[PDB]
Scaffold this active site. Structure first.
Site, PDB file in Angstrom:
ATOM      1  CB  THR A   1      -0.945   0.050   1.219  1.00 57.82           C
ATOM      2  OG1 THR A   1      -1.717  -1.157   1.283  1.00 57.82           O
ATOM      3  CG2 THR A   1      -1.893   1.256   1.131  1.00 57.82           C
ATOM      4  CD  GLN A   2       4.409   2.507  -3.809  1.00 57.02           C
ATOM      5  OE1 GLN A   2       4.434   3.609  -4.367  1.00 57.02           O
ATOM      6  NE2 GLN A   2       5.163   1.489  -4.211  1.00 57.02           N
TER       7      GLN A   2
ATOM      8  CG  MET B   1      -2.479  -6.575  -1.516  1.00 54.72           C
ATOM      9  SD  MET B   1      -3.804  -5.773  -2.449  1.00 54.72           S
ATOM     10  CE  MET B   1      -4.367  -4.557  -1.258  1.00 54.72           C
ATOM     11  CG  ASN B   2       4.911  -2.861  -2.521  1.00 55.20           C
ATOM     12  OD1 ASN B   2       6.013  -3.324  -2.809  1.00 55.20           O
ATOM     13  ND2 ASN B   2       4.733  -1.585  -2.184  1.00 55.20           N
TER      14      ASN B   2
END
Lengths: 243, 233
Positions: B1-2, B107-108
């Protein structure tokens, strides 16, 4: 005795016989040389044509590391490939972290420490290759030669394989006759001659010549293979000198 | 998550009869702050591909390094690295498309929208889009961010379908791209006047143009506009 049966065992002399036995495999291999020049390095190698069935120009032995380093070796060819694969990982992780391409002395030690590591345990075999390599970096040109023991030094000229003594003798003459320096285009021609002269020690099968070079002026600091007209010019030069 | 920090806006592109055009402004925004003005968001791979990247700049710089390292790796043990076994646009895209989807699945994500514009070895035009979700698509015109909303409509007036591509010349195509860049400068609050444009042609090869400026702008009518309704002075 039995000191030669296991790797990483000191004989009463203080020697590691398994490494010396690996050198015998290198001595058995084909001739390969390296010539340091004004603003770069030149690599050349003897490719024995075992049969007519070998496709010419399509069994390349000289390998590039990163974009600026050239590697050539004599002995067990697969071992040499394994070493280059490692070099490429070492060079990639250097550039990844430090941005700049790996310097040649830095790169030389990366291989050196890896080969040396294979003389520390009995669960691995020493490398059956002497590796001549080098390139151009921020500090200029560098030529190195690495041996099964992990020993390496900087060289003006380097040679290894079955015709190493013939090549060394011819290399020593160049160093004496050119104290101010040898040019890149000259070194390519000389490299061809020395491979042809060193072929006298392996003259049953005829051979194929392969040359590469890094040069700050000629190749813009990058490793390139010598092909086409420049290669044929070097072959003719060598053909003229043997006769 | 960014969450993206330093960002690059629209990348626009289109196909024409002999190749592709791609353009992107030289701005590195930091929220509303127009922080960096010398940013190159078009990155050539070889002499036959240009990758245009919008979104997070730190992730753009990571992608640059991957493409740079891809060229190196392709050269290894490859006598035909500058010939038959050279990198194709389709190879470069699929690699990126793989990486983008792998990262979204972990998820990145790499917080980017990417357009790979180039010309294949057989002379075919290559233009394809991929983003942080790993969503891919292809079209005669492609655009990211505001470009999707404003540029595409204008570019589609020129090349509305596949059959319009052979009819469109490099002069017409470039004119539409440059016009679109002006429209984006009028209306996109995170755009800059300075931009780069690249043309990959199957005959003339890669032409990379730097330091272009939006020009021939209409601002004169602004003097006549007074107040917001009733005000006469």
């Amino acid at each position: 005795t039995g000191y030669d049966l296991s790797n990483s065992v000191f004989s009463p002399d203080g020697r590691n016989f398994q490494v010396e036995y690996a050198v015998k495999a290198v001595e058995n291999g084909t001739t390969s040389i390296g010539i340091k020049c004004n603003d770069g390095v030149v690599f050349a190698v003897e490719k024995l044509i075992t049969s007519k069935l070998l496709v010419p120009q399509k069994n390349v032995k000289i390998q590039v590391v990163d974009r600026h380093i050239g590697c050539v070796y004599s002995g067990l060819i697969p071992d040499g490939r394994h070493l280059v694969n490692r070099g490429r990982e070492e060079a990639a992780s250097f550039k990844k972290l430090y941005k700049t391409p790996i310097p040649i002395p830095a790169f030389a030690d990366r291989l050196g420490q890896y080969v040396q590591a294979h003389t520390l345990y009995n669960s691995v075999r020493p490398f059956g290759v002497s590796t001549i390599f080098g390139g151009v970096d921020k500090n200029g040109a560098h030529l190195y030669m690495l041996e099964p023991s992990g020993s390496y030094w900087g060289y003006k000229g380097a040679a290894t394989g079955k015709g190493r003594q013939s090549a060394k003798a011819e290399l020593e003459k160049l160093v004496d006759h050119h104290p101010e320096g040898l040019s890149a285009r000259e070194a390519v021609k000389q490299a061809a001659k020395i491979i042809y002269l060193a072929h006298e020690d392996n003259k049953e099968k005829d051979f194929e010549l392969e040359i590469s070079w890094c040069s700050l002026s000629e190749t813009n600091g990058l490793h390139k293979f010598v092909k086409g007209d420049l290669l044929q010019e070097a072959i003719d030069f060598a053909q003229k000198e043997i006769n | 998550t960014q969450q993206p920090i330093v960002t690059g806006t629209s990348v626009i592109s289109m196909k024409y009869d002999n190749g592709v055009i791609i353009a992107a402004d030289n701005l590195g925004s930091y929220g509303s702050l127009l922080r960096f003005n010398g940013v190159e968001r078009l990155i050539p791979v070889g002499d036959n591909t240009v990758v245009g990247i919008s979104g997070d700049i730190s992730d753009m710089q990571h992608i640059e390094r991957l493409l740079k390292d891809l060229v190196t790796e392709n050269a290894y043990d490859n006598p035909l690295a500058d010939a038959e076994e050279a990198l194709e646009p389709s190879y470069i895209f699929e690699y990126l498309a793989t990486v983008m989807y792998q990262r979204r699945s972990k998820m990145n994500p790499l917080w980017n929208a990417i357009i790979v514009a180039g010309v294949q070895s057989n002379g075919d035009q290559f233009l394809r889009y991929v983003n942080l979700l790993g969503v891919t698509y292809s079209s005669p015109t492609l655009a990211t961010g505001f470009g999707a909303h404003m540029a595409n409509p204008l570019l589609r007036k020129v090349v509305d379908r596949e059959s319009d591509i052979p009819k469109t010349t490099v002069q017409v195509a470039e004119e539409a791209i440059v016009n679109a860049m002006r429209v984006l400068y009028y209306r996109d609050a995170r755009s800059s006047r300075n931009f780069s444009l690249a043309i990959i042609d199957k005959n003339t090869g890669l032409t990379f143009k730097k330091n272009l400026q939006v020009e021939n702008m209409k601002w004169d009518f602004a003097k006549d506009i007074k107040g917001y309704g009733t005000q006469k002075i």
